[PDB]
Structures are given as structure tokens and as C-alpha cells.
Amino acid sequence: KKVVLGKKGDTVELTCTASQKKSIQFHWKNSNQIKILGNQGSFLTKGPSKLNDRADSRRSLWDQGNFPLIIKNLKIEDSDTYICEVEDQKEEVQLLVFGLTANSDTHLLQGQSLTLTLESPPGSSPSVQCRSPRGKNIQGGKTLSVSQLELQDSGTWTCTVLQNQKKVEFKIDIVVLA
Amino acid sequence: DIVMTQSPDSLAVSLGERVTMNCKSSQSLLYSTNQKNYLAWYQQKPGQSPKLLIYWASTRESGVPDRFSGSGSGTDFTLTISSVQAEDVAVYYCQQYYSYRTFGGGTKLEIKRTVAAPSVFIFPPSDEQLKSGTASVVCLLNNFYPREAKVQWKVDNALQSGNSQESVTEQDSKDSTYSLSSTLTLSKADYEKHKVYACEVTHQGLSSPVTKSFNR
């Protein structure tokens, strides 16, 4: 069903609800079938996955029937389809993690070039639109270039990355000096 | 970009034999997270759009015969045809969709079959073309194998050189033969000067050369 976009280095919460509004057993796993985490009573057990240290739940919410999966310090390679198994019902959440960095250049001079590169999971087909501080709207794809920065381009750029019909927004600080 | 390399460029295989085509990428197409290889194969028959055969390296598209199978992993992949059929004549492309999209340069598949001699036909220029002031004489070589054939034009016994053009069809998807057209172009005035037009065909299916001719 659901598709969720996350940002590299940030944290996401994938949701799972039971029709029952009481505390019952549940577990999460990835598409490669490897168990992420689940429970015995209200004892949380983590599993084998490469997600181990970065995966957690929210123990306090189990009573209302929220058994969320929380994944911290997101990597691009956390992009996967995740599956929540509750009351023998299955609930599917697809995660795509994107990153957007200035190559190796945030402090530039007037007249110089800016080039941002987008990082995305396998099979993606994204595009990027940024707005400069002076409100000029710029398009790109894997790469986004500005060839001749002005003094008014110094400040926070707001860049939105879109895959099909879901978007994630970035803020990038760029210094342009004389 | 990831570079996709196919080999060989072309392959000839007898009907019913097995065929293996290799595709190599400059970097791994195996996603460690889900253990899937982001690799597809397409078939492009002469005249048509490419058509999807296989995706995830080894999942056969719905409707594709199971004689087609994929294998390999990481940076090296194979498309196999377990028993080649006549209809399989085509060019085969691999494509990675791991990071953007790139196609390999293709492997052309040709079929070997038993020898078949061409049936030969000659056509005079039409009255309608002659009215407009030109003359094309055409020699057809129909349904032969292998591809090699020699066509010699003679006009009142003069061997013609440099004034004809040949064209060969793609291998037939049903009987695996070729056909070949040869067109002799002469001005009308010159066509009117001569009597006997002949094309002489040599082909290993033929015990001696076959000549077909007309008198204007």
C-alpha cells in the first residue's frame, strides 16, 4: 500500500495499526524475509538484520495498537519494502531514502558554479527542483547545476526531490562571497 | 554511467541447439539490501520495437517461452535459449536499471539450417517506367541458404559491372532463408540498344549456375 520517502542521515517512523485497540503481538521484517524486530509480552526482541543498531520501536504506543518501526541515521541502502505482521494480518510499507549534497563546495565566489548531486536507491527515476534565496526556480535530475552564482544566491536553497508522486524536501546552505 | 558490454556481437546457431549470450556491467547490479539484480533483457526483431523478455536478471516476462532463461549475478549475466527456434532471429539487448538506465550494445542471433537453392526470377522494366525515360531490370533470388550468392548481369553477353545494386532481406522468421534483389539501372536509350537481358546466379545449393533471361 504505502510509500514513504526518507532523507539520508535522518530518522523515519513506519506505521502499523491493528484493528484491535489493545496490546497484541507483532513483528517487522524486510523483503529479503530477515526479521527486524518484534515482541514477547512487552519485551522487544531485535533480530538478525543489518538494521539492528539503528532499528527500534515505541514501547509506550503498543496499547493503542501502534507498533511503529523507527529507523535512525537512514542510509540510501535502507530503501526496501518493509512488512508488519499483526493479528495474522500483513501491512506493507515501502521506504525510499534520498540524499542531496553539494559535491565538495559550499563556500564559493561570485561568478562560480554550483553543482548538487542527488543520491537515490536502485531503480529510481527522480528529479529535483530548487529555489534560490532570490526565489529563482531551478530544475535538474541526477545533477543540478548553476553556472554563475550571484551575491544574492548566498543563503538557504530549498530543494525538492520527487519520485513519481512523493516528494522529500532538502535545505542547503550556500555561501557566495565577493 | 554504468557501462554494459555484450558479447559476442553476433552468433550463428543451428535450429534446436542451445545459445548463450553474455552481458557484463562495469559495476555490480546486485542490490545488497533486497538481493535483487537490476538487470533486464529485451528482444528486438527486425523492423520492431524492443520487447521485454526478462527482468530481475531471471524472471521471465508473462508470455515469453521458457526456452528463454536468464542467470548470473553482480557484474556478469547470461541469456540462454535452451533450444533455438526459427522465430528467435533477432538482436538481444541487456539493460541495467540499477542506477539510471543503460543498454549493452546487442547480440545479433542468426540461424543455421540446411542448404536451400534460390528460385530465380527476372523482371523487365515496365512500360510505365520506360515512358518516363529510365529502365530498371530486376533479378530476384528467392528463399535460399546460406547467405552467400553471386549475381552476374549480362546484356547481349556483355558482363555488367558497377551499374547494379543488391539488397538482402533479414532471415525469414519461418523458414530461416534469405531472399536477394538485384537491380540493374540503364538509361532508356541504352536499354533500347540491346536485346538479351540475363542474370546468372551462383549458389552452393545449385549444381551449376542458373540463368534467367528475356529479349526486349
Next chain:
Amino acid sequence: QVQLQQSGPEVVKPGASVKMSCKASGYTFTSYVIHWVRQKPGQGLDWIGYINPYNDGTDYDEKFKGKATLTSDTSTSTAYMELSSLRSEDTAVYYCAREKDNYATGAWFAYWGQGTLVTVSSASTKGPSVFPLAPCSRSTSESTAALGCLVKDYFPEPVTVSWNSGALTSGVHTFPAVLQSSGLYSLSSVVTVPSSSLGTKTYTCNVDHKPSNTKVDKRVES
């Protein structure tokens, strides 16, 4: 059933621009990414780039940045590719293709258009003359005869040939076009038929040369 229907073949002058279209149907236009691919005659497939019709977001291969521009029209369900500053080496069939699925779950090209052949030349378009190919005399001890149509002196490619409005397909061979020294193309299409049928059955070749809007139906008789 999803279909991608592309615009007809075009000649374009060296240095100018061409704009071609890809009309999609049988699915919700803004749900899937559309890609474009180049195939020069007899060569491999070169991926150009793609468009997300949802917001017209775009991405181009390195090789095609500045050379191609992609747009789409949501209301008419149509994607456009424009190519600019064309040169002789840009002559090719250009395809649009649709991803199987979205959100990286179907990134391969499951559906394809039929392609648009774009020829880069400063020459006028020219429709072909169509001449019958018939035996000098229409009989022998020969049980099989050959008939045809010579489609001569047209520019640019392609021309299509059918027989008896598509009702005659077996035994038909349409040869690849040959570029003559004149700089015009010529092609023959032939069919083999029983000698017994000659002078009883009607054989007609249907020729279509879209770049010049030339269509001819020619009845072939010896």
C-alpha cells in the same frame, strides 16, 4: 491495454530542431515515468532520459544534456521530445517507453512506442514512383511465379508496402531500401504465388510514403 503511439517520420535540416510526440493510453498518464531511447540505423539502443509526467520533472543522460528537451501534456496524455541543433549523425529511430511500475519497483521498460524515424538532411522530400514487377510472359512449366512492385526514388526513409490491403502476407518479401547514387532511396517488394493463379487473382501493392503524403495502390499484371 497500455499503448504508446508515436508521431510520424520527419526530415529535418542540419542545424534545425525537431519535435516529436508519444501518445499514451490505457493507464493513468501521471502514474509512471516515460523514457526515451535513440537507435541509429543498424546500431544499438542509447538511453536519452525521462520525464515524470506528474510535474514534468526531467533527467537526461550525460550524452544528451542540451541536445534533448522533454515535456508532457497531461490533458492529452502525451509526451514530447524536442531535439535541437541536429546534425547528420543524429539520423535515427527514437522510441518512448514506459516503466513497468513506479517507486523503483518496475524500473525496466515494459511498454514501447513503435518509434519515429528522424532523418537529418537539407534535401527536399520526394514521393516514390511505383512500377509493377511482372514476368515478361506469364507462364511456363514453372509451378510458382513471382510478382512485385518497384518503389523508386523517394526521400527520406521509410516507405511501407502491403499487398492486397494486408490480406496477402505469405510469400511476401519487402527488401531493405538501397540509397542510390542520386541520393534517393529505392526498394522492391515481391511475392511468390502459384503460376495457375496469374490472370485470375488480383495482386495489388499498397505503398505509403508518409513524409511526402504519397499513397499508391498499384495492381500488378503481366
